[PDB]
Symmetry: C5
Subunit: 385 residues, 5 copies
């Protein structure tokens, strides 16, 4: 007789698969688990879910599947289909849709009754995401493995291995994605929602950090590009009537661009992300450039103004060294029309050189409000790097 | 003999799982339920559905699964697979797609015949959404648990616990999302669509309110930004020929922006939301700014107009203090060409100072139609806060 | 003995569930159905499908499930699982994907053999949509219930109730959506695709009408907004050099807006919708405004033109009352250069006042081509309302 | 005894459903099929798939389900569940996802052993799409029905009916969609991937043609609209300084529009579609309009140029008839400043009339490069119509 | 007796399908596989997955399904349902969702016990994508077939055929898509995650290359189009006041276009793709064109400047040959006002001809920075072609 199916006839003849396998019912069946995390497939932030592929394994002690290796040609391990034995109902408290993993149809059984079960499982799980510092963020998502029905008296959950070996496990993990795990942190916890019920659970805090190197060329590269167009835009002469149309076109291009980057961050009501506050301050610096162009074109215009006041013309003089026959009465009438002509040219000429020395020094103030304000960026960048 | 599977052989030997378990058929099997709501996953408003994760439990009385704890070593609870016993067909009247929850394969049975069943269930349910006051809204969505086939004579539905304990249940609930539940309100109701049929149902009015703090920085922050660009835009001199091109560019940027925010609110035919009516009034204030610029550039232009009328020049004078040899005949011909030259300059100069004192006071009217109209915003904001 | 499972042992002992239950095989099993329509979930027009939630019920006569209420304690109704009896294969000819409804696991049986079956069913069904008059449209979608395999000799289909009661059934229906049903119209029809096969079917013409009140504020509110910007745009003086840049900017904004509304209507080759033809006529009215601005700026320009012809200057005069020492030769040379100077100013001044009296009356023609053309809108609106 | 389930007890008592039913194993079981195509649901071109709803039927000869109509009250047809008999594994070589069709749970059996099986089946099938002539295209997609495991020796595939009747079958087909089938073309073919294996297959070449009447109002209606704006745009005078800003705005609007229509056509590397080549030639005609405006504004400008050369002024004269006391020395100084003034006006006046007669004839060349080039469109349209 | 179901009664009478079929348990069951790849359906790069349709087959040796062809009329092959025998649990380590393939319900068995199993299987598999050289890229995605539970002692994996025949297999493969496979490379590998467990696996490195011919007309055709608009844009005279509005409009159109092409490439943190670095250098060349227009309009303007310095006027002269009665005092006053008039015209005239000879030679430098920089494109194109 072949000895490998003589054994399965001995185990599964009178085996009843609907009974929690134990001889004294007062003790629990202590399962023992661990995770080996393979990949982080996607982090959906607007929906606050997280899909993950995990290699997973359990063992528990089945007191009805015991034998001796003699009378069976020293068989010490054996494979049984999963649908023909008892199996616990351990699942996750935090799933959203779990139908993506196939069922492994086989389990091992040892000669002491140690049934061990290997299966892959994908987990579209719901964990709250903190998105405050957007390119430089670590996440803290839980994976609470628990028995759904059975209490402490029936099913208790411990680990396969030591909790140090779970923390530093990068044995299989797919790198060169968007995320990168630091550690998987296990913790036993006894859960109770009311009196007279207590449930075992095993949380796995998987922490991951975003690799930020892509988002420099999608959130900072056009923003610094829209600044060097603004720096060269002050070198238009304000008398052209084309400088204000330059600045409103630039702010138009900035405004369309900010729409594009708004859709990524979620509607989580803990506030705004920290980088999104900067694009408001980046946008308000364009308005100070837009309010500076309107002021000097209001100040310098062919409008037939009044005289420049010498109280400020002396103030502009100090800053200029810092930042820069009755035929006589008839023919007298024709020169008087030209007396008024060139003099009103010189009135607008007096307002003219005022609007350039206020153009230069306010361009220096704008250049120091950019160049000294960029040092604040790299020092917050280098320390958090 | 081990006593835990001796009991399951005693219960499930001649048990027929297709019969509603009762000895006198004239009495119903009164199930009893409650919900423990875990999260609100998404509220799709354009489709008017609502997905929700709920911890759920039932018990009913099975008169065929009774035993005595003696002859079984004082066993008082026991686990049976769900597919091997009777189970009611309680489901929801308002689902759209329910396939996302796994089946819990186990139930408890007590020694009196009290079968109790724990299961998670996700509910893409269809509830009508009222979206009138958009950032500040409470919702009222039903969850009508009922038996689909059985009538009052067969299955009646009551609650597990007191209806006060269901209302104030925040024991497990995931916060820091978009929504926040106030209460879950149960109510028994007897349903009847015709004569000779009556059905038990248990409605659960779950009310939730949106946390509005995110939508201030996505529906009010660019709208107030497009006003301070409009306030500074009046400081262009109207003689530039660049002011009307400024105002139409601004209204262009506003018009593109209103497209972006239109896609959120649904096509529900109860009317428009209340905040969407304000963006029309916000848009019509830009037209009054756009109609004011066209009027003064029509009024002030190098066009060789007629004289300003002294009926309104005196009216502008009052508001200015409030808001602000035959050689003689040949040579006489050359001055007359300059007589006509400077005089038509002074005609346009007379229309010139009119268009600035009407520019200033209409800018004060526009500034008071903004600043006093913003007080209406925060008082409606603070009371509803 | 308990009498409720003594009955199910009597019915389902030798019952064979694979046989169409009848004693004389020459007669059909006449099923009888009706629908109770609950909601219209979505109408996808680009794909021409329609999803609908329907409460549904059948009964047929099973000649093998008969008993007498005596010997069973006057039991007259009983519940049997659906998978343990015969059930017809009645389904829809027009489905696209039907997997969204759960299976009701129970049926009633009466003491005469009247098995009745209640189930919900969702129907992503394919019906052709007529989209000609877009906001004001009724639809006519079929729901052809038929047996897929069995012919007239085996399965015939009739109704539960009278066909008048199906038509006026609004007992349960979720209102305050986008659609609103007028009636559900049943009609028996015998189907035959060839010789020697005839099939019963029961069509249900469900007609629904769109509530159009939302699409007034998404298809007419910006279109009338882009007209009042065009009406005020004629009050620019044509000498500014900023009026043509105003009109092309407006047509730019209109052109981008028409892209946004194009994606809703499908690629159904019965033609264009009727409202989409109007937006072409709405767009061509902007070109007549754009061709009118180009004509007067071509007519009025500092170009050193020729004289205005008195054949049309008299025509403009009639419409103006309707719509509105050798020192002498040397010094004679300097006045002749000013003779040519002011005269060519008066030549452009003669073309100047022509271009305003043609500006005013063509603005009246444009104002009457708008105001009288809007009366055509509301009269087609009020009658179809 | 009722005779309809006495027959099913006679057929399915010792019937083994895992054996290919034949008495001499050396002959094949010749199935016979046909398709009745109901609708073409969608053609996804970027993914190159095709979903189709097909009414489908098979018959094969089962030598174990034979009887005589006597001893059974002249029963000649009978219904058996599909899961209780043998059924071939005929499926499609070209599917992508086939889970959308329900299983018909019944088959007919005749008294000779002719089992016939009716089922609907939806087919998201993968066929390569040729998209060269985009609005006027026929497709040629295969549907290769074959047995997946069994060879020629076990399962052979023929047709139900004559192959002429399959070709001209429009008995049920949903029209008024986007597509329209010409014919379904069957062809038997013996498949072999290596030595010692040969497989029967039955290809069904379904050819469909797009109804092009919708895409005239979405690919040609705005393109001809952006030409009549270009035709009227030449009537701006080139001295305005607003004509180049008109032409770049138009090319901006064209460039945004071409983005919108690019997303439809796939990334199939057989080249570009033929209509997409025309929009490049449509775009390059705008550049010749844009290069013509830049040339005449470079030629006509207040720049203090040199003299016009009489070598080309005579050439412009020919085309103009085709396409169109020491007081004397002091006072002599003041006329010499006006000698230089009006003469440089006449130098720019000489370049002025040159730039209009080159404006008119190059506008005639552009008008003949449009009007004669539109005749090429309708002749390629009418023949392919 | 018919001999084909007499054989299946002999094999499957006492067959236990839950036992790994072997007589001596110490030897493994060596399965043997290969793949025949049919199509590459989609490559999702933002999600880094890959869907593939593969024809697949296995055989293993079943020691319990042996017979002799005599006593069964020389039957040497036979078909058994898959659910009635043992089958290994060979699956893929790298799947994401595998539910899209149907189950083939049949297997062959030979008279020696060689069970062979044919099935199609679709594989949304997760492989890391290298996207550095975007249009010209080869991919290297693994397909690791392994037994999930069984070790080396139970299941070992080898190939059907020689590993050379797998490499050059294009027998069935759907061409004329986006991708094109070079080879499928098999490699045996023994896997071990810890001590005391060793697993067989069979990697299949399928390498595919993108056909780049479509992306020339979607990533290079508008980019070279936005250069010839820039080349003709220098032929505007800088005195128009319309040239800077031309250049900012062009950069606006370029900036919107770069948004459109950004969404394809993923967020993989290995850096940026190589073609995306070029569009930054393509964008910075427009800024040098935009900084050149601002410089000459700052240099040439009616501003009443000072004199041009003869240190650079001589430098411009060298490059111009390379790149190009008390009535007397009263009447003396009127000429002095015209002395100042024409002289300040000649001051701006002196700056005028400077700004054209710097316009021409900087246009030659820009033309050589384009034409010589395009030779770098085609040489990198032709070698990698
Ligand atoms: C949600 O809506 C339901 C009905 O639409 C409200 O239920 C009503 O509650 C009042 C107060 O208890 C009862 O008098 C009515 O009989 C109830 N109506 C029905 C149809 O049962 C419910 O109060 C609403 N929720 C909130 C928070 O107001
Ligand atoms: C669709 O394509 C197939 C092949 O790609 C065409 O089938 C060919 O038809 C001709 C004419 O009957 C035969 O001579 C060839 O042998 C067929 N080819 C194959 C591979 O069998 C088919 O004709 C095409 N459809 C149309 C409408 O032309
Ligand atoms: N083929 C993968 C077998 C395997 C090896 N080590 C494992 C660890 C966990 C697990 O679920 C599975 C495994
Ligand atoms: N593991 C969660 C068990 C659990 C504890 N309390 C519960 C309440 C309801 C429920 O369905 C389930 C539970
Ligand atoms: N719980 C809903 C039971 C029900 C009451 N009336 C009905 C009518 C039809 C139907 O399918 C079902 C019903
Ligand atoms: N109810 C549709 C029955 C039917 C009638 N003719 C048919 C032809 C083919 C098929 O699969 C089915 C049919
Ligand atoms: N009908 C396809 C049968 C077939 C022929 N050759 C094959 C090779 C592999 C495979 O899985 C299947 C096949």
């Amino acid at each position: 007789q072949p000895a490998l199916l003589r054994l399965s006839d001995h185990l599964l003849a009178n085996y009843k698969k609907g009974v929690r396998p134990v001889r004294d019912w007062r003790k629990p069946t202590t399962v023992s688990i661990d995770v080996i995390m393979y990949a982080i497939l996607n982090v959906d932030e607007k929906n606050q879910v997280l899909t993950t592929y995990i290699w997973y394994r359990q063992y528990w002690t089945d007191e009805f599947l015991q034998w001796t290796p003699e009378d069976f040609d020293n068989v010490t391990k054996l494979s049984i289909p999963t649908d023909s034995i008892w199996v616990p109902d351990i699942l996750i408290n935090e799933f959203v849709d779990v139908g993506k993993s196939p069922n492994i149809p086989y389990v091992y059984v040892h000669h002491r009754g140690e049934v061990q079960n290997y299966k892959p499982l994908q987990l579209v799980t719901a964990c709250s995401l903190d998105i405050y510092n957007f390119p430089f963020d670590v996440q803290n998502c839980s994976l609470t493995f628990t028995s759904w029905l059975h209490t402490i008296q029936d099913i208790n959950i411990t680990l396969w291995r030591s909790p140090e070996e779970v923390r530093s496990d990068k044995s299989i993990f797919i790198n060169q994605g968007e995320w990168e795990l630091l550690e998987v942190f296990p913790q036993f916890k006894e859960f109770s929602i009311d009196i007279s019920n207590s449930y075992a659970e095993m949380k796995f805090y998987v922490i991951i950090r975003r690799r930020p190197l892509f988002y420099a060329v999608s959130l900072l590269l056009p923003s610094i590009f829209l600044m060097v167009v603004d720096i060269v835009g002050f070198c238009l002469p304000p008398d052209s009537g084309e400088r204000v149309s330059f600045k409103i076109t630039l702010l138009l291009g900035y405004s369309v661009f900010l729409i594009i980057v708004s859709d990524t961050l979620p509607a989580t009501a803990i506030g705004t992300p920290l980088i999104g506050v900067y694009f408001v301050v980046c946008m308000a610096l364009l308005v100070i450039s837009l309010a500076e162009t309107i002021f000097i074109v209001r100040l310098v215009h062919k409008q037939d103004l009044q005289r420049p006041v010498p109280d400020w013309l002396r103030h502009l003089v100090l800053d200029r060294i810092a930042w820069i026959r009755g035929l006589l009465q008839e023919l007298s009438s024709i020169r008087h029309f030209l007396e008024k002509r060139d003099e009103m040219r010189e009135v607008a000429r007096d307002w003219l050189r005022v609007g350039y020395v206020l153009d230069r020094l306010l361009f220096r103030i704008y250049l120091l409000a950019v160049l000294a304000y960029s040092i604040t960026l790299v020092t917050l960048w280098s320390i958090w790097h």
